[PDB]
Specification:
This is part of a larger assembly, with chains A (about 100 residues) and B (about 30 residues).
Chain A: H1 17-29, H2 37-41, H3 48-53, H4 55-62, H5 64-75, H6 81-91
Helix pairs in contact in A: 4-5
Chain B: H1 10-31
Classes of the chains: A mainly alpha (about 100), B mainly alpha (about 30).
């Protein structure tokens, strides 16, 4: 809701999953009783279709596979030679 | 249609009025 409204996880300005959510609301209110299986099997449907759309968000906006090998190369030191020249110079003036 | 699919109730209409304010707040600043 902060940055941009077409970037939503469920599909709220941009998709029609919330009318499926409206159908879920219609299914879950007229029931006078309560149990565990009927409540939690549709806790999948408010999660699983929502848990895939943001996965299909951040692939295209960022090139996911780009920075998430880059940030490991800065910390686990994949570019090994590229920091030793830093280490050689930083030794002579951290004395 | 149905009340229990329209849920609920007054903050959804208020979040409809804020783009109704917004469609004038967005179009005034273009003219300024």
């Amino acid at each position: 809701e902060n940055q941009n409204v077409n970037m939503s996880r469920t599909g709220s300005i941009l998709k029609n999953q919330e009318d499926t959510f409206a159908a879920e609301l219609h299914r879950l209110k007229q029931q006078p009783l309560f149990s565990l299986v009927d409540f939690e099997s549709v806790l999948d449907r408010i999660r699983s279709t929502v848990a895939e759309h943001l996965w299909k968000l951040m692939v295209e906006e960022s090139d996911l596979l780009g920075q998430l090998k880059i940030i490991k190369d800065f910390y686990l030191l994949g570019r090994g030679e590229l920091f030793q020249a830093f280490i050689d110079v930083a030794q002579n003036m951290l004395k | 249609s149905e009340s229990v699919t329209c849920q609920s109730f007054e903050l959804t209409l208020r979040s409809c009025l804020y783009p109704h304010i917004g469609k004038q707040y967005l179009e005034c600043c273009g003219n300024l």
